[PDB]
Coordinates of all heavy atoms in Angstrom, one line a residue:
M209 N -16.2 6.3 -2.9 CA -15.5 7.2 -2.0 C -14.3 6.4 -1.5 O -14.4 5.3 -1.0 CB -16.5 7.6 -0.9 CG -15.8 8.5 0.2 SD -16.3 10.3 0.0 CE -15.0 11.1 0.9
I210 N -13.1 7.1 -1.5 CA -11.9 6.4 -1.1 C -11.9 6.5 0.5 O -11.6 5.6 1.1 CB -10.6 7.0 -1.7 CG1 -10.6 6.8 -3.2 CG2 -9.4 6.4 -1.1 CD1 -11.3 5.5 -3.7
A211 N -12.1 7.7 1.0 CA -12.0 8.0 2.4 C -12.9 7.0 3.3 O -14.0 6.8 3.0 CB -12.4 9.4 2.8
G212 N -12.3 6.4 4.3 CA -13.0 5.5 5.1 C -13.0 4.0 4.7 O -13.3 3.1 5.5
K213 N -12.5 3.8 3.5 CA -12.4 2.4 3.0 C -11.1 1.7 3.4 O -10.1 2.4 3.8 CB -12.7 2.3 1.5 CG -13.9 3.0 1.1 CD -14.8 2.0 0.5 CE -16.0 2.7 -0.2 NZ -16.7 3.6 0.8
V214 N -11.1 0.4 3.2 CA -9.9 -0.4 3.5 C -9.4 -0.9 2.1 O -10.1 -1.6 1.4 CB -10.2 -1.6 4.3 CG1 -9.0 -2.5 4.5 CG2 -10.7 -1.2 5.7
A215 N -8.2 -0.4 1.7 CA -7.6 -0.8 0.4 C -6.4 -1.8 0.5 O -5.4 -1.5 1.3 CB -7.2 0.5 -0.3
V216 N -6.5 -2.9 -0.2 CA -5.5 -3.9 -0.1 C -4.7 -3.9 -1.4 O -5.3 -4.1 -2.5 CB -6.1 -5.3 0.0 CG1 -4.9 -6.3 0.0 CG2 -6.8 -5.5 1.3
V217 N -3.4 -3.6 -1.3 CA -2.5 -3.5 -2.5 C -1.5 -4.6 -2.4 O -0.7 -4.7 -1.5 CB -1.8 -2.1 -2.5 CG1 -0.9 -2.0 -3.7 CG2 -2.8 -1.0 -2.5
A218 N -1.5 -5.5 -3.5 CA -0.6 -6.6 -3.5 C 0.7 -6.3 -4.3 O 0.7 -5.9 -5.5 CB -1.2 -7.8 -4.2
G219 N 1.9 -6.3 -3.5 CA 3.1 -5.9 -4.1 C 3.5 -4.5 -3.8 O 2.7 -3.6 -3.8
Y220 N 4.7 -4.4 -3.3 CA 5.2 -3.0 -2.9 C 6.3 -2.5 -3.7 O 7.3 -1.9 -3.3 CB 5.7 -3.0 -1.4 CG 5.6 -1.7 -0.8 CD1 4.4 -0.9 -0.9 CD2 6.7 -1.1 -0.1 CE1 4.4 0.4 -0.4 CE2 6.6 0.2 0.4 CZ 5.5 0.9 0.3 OH 5.4 2.2 0.9
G221 N 6.2 -2.7 -5.0 CA 7.2 -2.2 -5.9 C 6.9 -0.7 -6.1 O 6.1 -0.1 -5.3
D222 N 7.5 -0.1 -7.1 CA 7.3 1.3 -7.4 C 5.8 1.5 -7.6 O 5.2 2.5 -7.1 CB 8.1 1.7 -8.6 CG 9.6 1.9 -8.2 OD1 9.9 1.9 -7.0 OD2 10.4 2.1 -9.1
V223 N 5.1 0.6 -8.4 CA 3.7 0.8 -8.6 C 3.0 0.6 -7.3 O 2.0 1.4 -7.0 CB 3.2 -0.3 -9.6 CG1 1.7 -0.3 -9.6 CG2 3.7 0.0 -11.0
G224 N 3.3 -0.3 -6.5 CA 2.7 -0.5 -5.2 C 2.8 0.7 -4.3 O 1.8 1.2 -3.8
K225 N 4.0 1.1 -4.1 CA 4.3 2.3 -3.3 C 3.4 3.5 -3.7 O 2.9 4.2 -2.9 CB 5.8 2.7 -3.3 CG 6.7 1.6 -2.9 CD 8.1 1.7 -3.5 CE 9.1 1.3 -2.5 NZ 9.4 -0.2 -2.7
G226 N 3.3 3.7 -5.0 CA 2.5 4.8 -5.6 C 1.0 4.6 -5.4 O 0.3 5.6 -5.1
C227 N 0.5 3.4 -5.6 CA -0.9 3.1 -5.4 C -1.3 3.3 -3.9 O -2.3 3.9 -3.6 CB -1.2 1.7 -5.9 SG -1.0 1.5 -7.6
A228 N -0.4 2.7 -3.0 CA -0.6 2.8 -1.6 C -0.7 4.2 -1.1 O -1.6 4.6 -0.4 CB 0.5 2.0 -0.9
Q229 N 0.3 5.1 -1.5 CA 0.3 6.4 -1.1 C -0.9 7.2 -1.6 O -1.4 8.2 -0.9 CB 1.6 7.1 -1.6 CG 1.8 8.5 -0.9 CD 3.0 9.2 -1.5 OE1 3.4 9.0 -2.6 NE2 3.6 10.1 -0.6
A230 N -1.4 6.8 -2.7 CA -2.6 7.5 -3.3 C -3.8 7.2 -2.4 O -4.3 8.1 -1.8 CB -2.9 7.0 -4.7
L231 N -4.2 6.0 -2.4 CA -5.3 5.5 -1.5 C -5.2 6.1 -0.1 O -6.0 6.8 0.4 CB -5.4 4.0 -1.5 CG -5.5 3.3 -2.9 CD1 -5.1 1.9 -2.8 CD2 -6.9 3.5 -3.4
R232 N -4.1 5.7 0.5 CA -3.8 6.2 1.9 C -3.9 7.7 2.1 O -4.3 8.1 3.1 CB -2.4 5.7 2.3 CG -2.0 6.1 3.7 CD -1.1 7.3 3.6 NE 0.3 7.0 3.4 CZ 1.0 6.3 4.2 NH1 0.5 5.7 5.4 NH2 2.3 6.1 4.0
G233 N -3.6 8.4 1.0 CA -3.7 9.9 1.1 C -5.1 10.4 1.0 O -5.3 11.6 1.1
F234 N -6.1 9.6 0.7 CA -7.4 10.0 0.5 C -8.3 9.6 1.7 O -9.5 10.0 1.8 CB -8.0 9.3 -0.7 CG -8.1 10.2 -1.9 CD1 -7.5 9.7 -3.1 CD2 -8.6 11.4 -1.9 CE1 -7.5 10.5 -4.3 CE2 -8.6 12.2 -3.0 CZ -8.1 11.8 -4.2
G235 N -7.7 9.0 2.7 CA -8.4 8.6 3.9 C -8.7 7.1 4.0 O -9.4 6.7 4.9
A236 N -8.1 6.3 3.1 CA -8.3 4.9 3.1 C -7.3 4.2 4.0 O -6.2 4.8 4.2 CB -8.2 4.4 1.7
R237 N -7.6 3.0 4.4 CA -6.7 2.3 5.3 C -6.1 1.3 4.4 O -6.8 0.4 3.9 CB -7.4 1.6 6.4 CG -6.4 0.8 7.3 CD -7.0 0.7 8.7 NE -8.2 -0.1 8.8 CZ -8.3 -1.4 8.9 NH1 -7.2 -2.1 9.0 NH2 -9.5 -2.0 8.9
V238 N -4.8 1.4 4.1 CA -4.0 0.5 3.2 C -3.3 -0.7 3.8 O -2.4 -0.5 4.7 CB -3.0 1.3 2.4 CG1 -2.4 0.4 1.3 CG2 -3.8 2.5 1.7
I239 N -3.6 -1.9 3.4 CA -3.0 -3.1 3.8 C -2.1 -3.6 2.7 O -2.5 -3.5 1.5 CB -4.0 -4.2 4.2 CG1 -4.9 -3.8 5.3 CG2 -3.3 -5.5 4.6 CD1 -6.1 -4.7 5.6
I240 N -0.9 -4.1 2.9 CA 0.0 -4.5 1.9 C 0.4 -5.9 2.0 O 0.7 -6.4 3.1 CB 1.2 -3.6 1.8 CG1 0.9 -2.4 0.9 CG2 2.4 -4.3 1.3 CD1 1.0 -1.1 1.5
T241 N 0.5 -6.6 0.9 CA 0.9 -8.0 0.9 C 2.2 -8.1 0.0 O 2.2 -7.5 -1.0 CB -0.2 -8.9 0.3 OG1 -0.1 -9.0 -1.1 CG2 -1.6 -8.4 0.7
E242 N 3.2 -8.8 0.5 CA 4.4 -8.9 -0.3 C 5.2 -10.2 0.0 O 4.9 -10.9 0.9 CB 5.4 -7.7 0.1 CG 5.5 -6.7 -0.9 CD 6.4 -7.0 -2.1 OE1 6.7 -8.2 -2.2 OE2 6.7 -6.2 -2.9
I243 N 6.1 -10.6 -0.9 CA 6.8 -11.8 -0.8 C 8.3 -11.5 -0.6 O 9.1 -12.4 -0.3 CB 6.7 -12.7 -2.1 CG1 7.4 -12.0 -3.2 CG2 5.3 -13.0 -2.4 CD1 7.7 -13.0 -4.4
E244 N 8.7 -10.2 -0.6 CA 10.0 -9.7 -0.4 C 10.2 -9.1 0.9 O 9.5 -8.2 1.4 CB 10.4 -8.7 -1.5 CG 11.1 -9.2 -2.7 CD 12.5 -9.7 -2.5 OE1 13.3 -9.0 -1.8 OE2 12.9 -10.8 -3.0
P245 N 11.3 -9.5 1.7 CA 11.6 -9.0 3.0 C 11.8 -7.5 3.0 O 11.2 -6.7 3.8 CB 12.8 -9.8 3.4 CG 12.9 -10.9 2.5 CD 12.3 -10.5 1.3
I246 N 12.8 -7.0 2.2 CA 13.1 -5.6 2.1 C 11.8 -4.7 1.8 O 11.4 -3.9 2.7 CB 14.1 -5.3 1.0 CG1 15.5 -5.7 1.5 CG2 14.2 -3.8 0.7 CD1 16.6 -5.7 0.4
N247 N 11.2 -4.9 0.7 CA 10.0 -4.2 0.3 C 9.0 -4.2 1.4 O 8.3 -3.2 1.6 CB 9.4 -4.9 -1.0 CG 10.2 -4.7 -2.2 OD1 9.8 -3.9 -3.1 ND2 11.3 -5.4 -2.3
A248 N 8.8 -5.4 2.1 CA 7.9 -5.5 3.2 C 8.3 -4.7 4.4 O 7.5 -4.0 4.9 CB 7.8 -7.0 3.5
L249 N 9.6 -4.7 4.7 CA 10.0 -3.9 5.9 C 9.8 -2.5 5.5 O 9.6 -1.7 6.4 CB 11.5 -4.1 6.1 CG 12.1 -3.5 7.4 CD1 11.3 -4.0 8.5 CD2 13.6 -3.8 7.5
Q250 N 9.8 -2.2 4.3 CA 9.5 -0.8 3.8 C 8.1 -0.4 4.0 O 7.8 0.7 4.6 CB 9.8 -0.7 2.3 CG 11.3 -0.6 2.0 CD 11.5 -0.3 0.5 OE1 12.6 0.2 0.1 NE2 10.5 -0.5 -0.3
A251 N 7.1 -1.3 3.6 CA 5.7 -1.0 3.8 C 5.4 -0.9 5.3 O 4.6 -0.1 5.7 CB 4.9 -2.1 3.2

């Protein structure tokens, strides 16, 4: 079950942004890890 879980997605590229929005849209709490300032400010 995705809803209620905590999902950690490493990297906020196009793949990351899409995975994050998926999980997050199901009721999961998404944490993101990145090495890039811009991408990070984005998340």
Side-chain angles (χ1 to χ4, degrees):
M209 177 101 200
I210 295 329
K213 306 243 191 305
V214 175
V216 179
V217 182
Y220 204 50
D222 283 353
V223 166
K225 301 155 146 90
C227 295
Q229 192 186 25
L231 303 164
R232 178 263 272 301
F234 260 128
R237 179 157 63 91
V238 186
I239 298 171
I240 270 122
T241 88
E242 255 284 9
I243 68 163
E244 268 289 316
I246 287 170
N247 291 251
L249 189 56
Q250 279 189 164

